[PDB]
Amino acid sequence: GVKVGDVVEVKKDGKKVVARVVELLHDPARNAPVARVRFEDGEERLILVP
């Protein structure tokens, strides 16, 4: 149920940190939503939506 602008916790360099959801995509292979998240410093990452 994660949507654009929401905030989630992920690991970055062994530390639990907050990232902001900037985009919702879909992985046809895993048949599951994927979110483009952006960290405080501007780094981005793709994460499978829990």
Numbering used by the authors: 3 to 52
Which sentences from the paper describe this structure?
Here, we discover that the previously reconstructed ancient DPBB sequence could also adopt a β-barrel fold named Double-Zeta β-barrel (DZBB), as a metamorphic protein. The DZBB fold is not found in any modern protein, although its structure shares similarities with RIFT and OB. Furthermore, the reconstructed OB fold could also be converted to the four-stranded SH3 fold by a simple circular permutation. Thus, these ancient β-barrel folds (DPBB, RIFT, OB, and SH3) could be readily interconverted by a few feasible mutations through the missing-link fold, DZBB, indicating their significantly close evolutionary relationships.
While design-23 had a random-coil structure, design-24 exhibited a CD spectrum for a folded protein and remained almost intact even at 90 °C. We also determined its crystal structure and confirmed that design-24 adopted the four-stranded SH3 fold.
